[PDB]
Design a binder for this molecule. Structure first.
Ligand SMILES: Cc1ccc(CN(C(=O)N[C@@H](CSCc2ccccc2)C(=O)O)C(=O)c2ccc(-c3cccc(-c4ccccc4-c4ccc(Cl)cc4)c3)cc2)cc1
Ligand SMILES: Cc1ccc(CN(C(=O)N[C@@H](CSCc2ccccc2)C(=O)O)C(=O)c2ccc(-c3cccc(-c4ccccc4-c4ccc(Cl)cc4)c3)cc2)cc1
Lengths: 133, 134
């Protein structure tokens, strides 16, 4: 409880300092690191890249289906994460933080139903780490 | 796992705009930053597989000799991270899991009372974020 938080803090910090030397705390900590890095790179390359409390999942799902028009790849999965994060930031800027959990729920729905099969068939997240880093 | 990934990414992107996913995500970021700053301010101004917690606890007790403060808590985190990195460099990756366990033990036995009396981790975020001045 009060204990778990500190354990979570120690893990996060140590993960970070390990990262800074090209080491990793765990495979998950490695996935997260590559995903953040990849997002940073995508956002820097495609810098030129409409949520409300009434927006349905179908509105999001249609826009994300335009992303995976020609098919799924690691670059396009990174763009998906980047897109979700841009929606969250837009919501906080517009004073609608209340929807950041909705966007997260939508991203987990879209990932599960459409991308987890592809991810599992193409060697999982371990393969993304292997390719990206 | 995918929820953990979505949460971590969104946390990160929020952080990059000065926003936070949660209070915990706000504390993790402040420590990362604070650690980076401490390590940069005290750069060059700076264990075995049989080392007990008592050996670590003593060295850390030297850090808090004149008392607990936020600057010194940041130094504690920084010290633990330096030990982990030293252990991996020295091929003793075994010690990383232990060092983390020792750090969580020292926190719950010696620092959590002080942390709770001085406004908790929310206060650290408040103070540190403010100190980030231009
Ligand atoms: C790090 C990282 C990532 C992604 C690229 C970019 N990339 C590639 O270069 N891809 C390679 C192989 S994947 C090789 C690979 C392996 C491992 C890691 C990362 C790549 C290729 O296809 O040649 C792509 O796959 C690519 C992807 C997307 C887009 C593009 C750009 C802008 C907008 C839209 C988009 C369309 C429809 C609906 C929504 C969006 C959208 C998306 C995000 C926002 Cl914030 C806003 C809108 C898509 C363009 C290119 C580079 C680096
Ligand atoms: C970001 C951040 C942090 C910490 C300073 C520095 N600082 C202060 O600024 N002190 C403030 C009060 S709290 C300022 C504050 C408020 C809010 C947020 C972050 C800071 C003051 O005195 O006015 C300190 O409290 C201070 C603390 C420690 C140390 C120091 C340095 C070298 C070695 C040792 C040390 C001694 C014994 C045993 C082990 C170690 C050790 C520690 C770390 C490593 Cl990697 C290796 C070894 C400790 C020096 C100073 C600056 C910036």
């Amino acid at each position: 409880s009060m204990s778990q938080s500190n354990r979570e803090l120690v893990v996060d910090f140590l993960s970070y300092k390990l990262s800074q030397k090209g080491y990793s705390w765990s495979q998950m900590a490695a996935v997260k690191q590559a995903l953040r890095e990849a997002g940073d790179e995508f956002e820097l390359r495609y810098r030129r890249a409409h949520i409300t409390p009434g927006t349905a999942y179908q509105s999001f799902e249609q826009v994300v289906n335009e992303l995976f028009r020609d098919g799924v790849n690691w670059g396009r999965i990174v763009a998906f994460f980047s897109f979700g994060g841009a929606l969250c930031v837009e919501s906080v800027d517009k004073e609608m933080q209340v929807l950041v959990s909705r966007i997260a729920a939508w991203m987990a729905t879209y990932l599960n139903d459409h991308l987890e099969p592809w991810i599992q068939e193409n060697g999982g997240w371990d393969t993304f780490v292997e390719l990206y880093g």
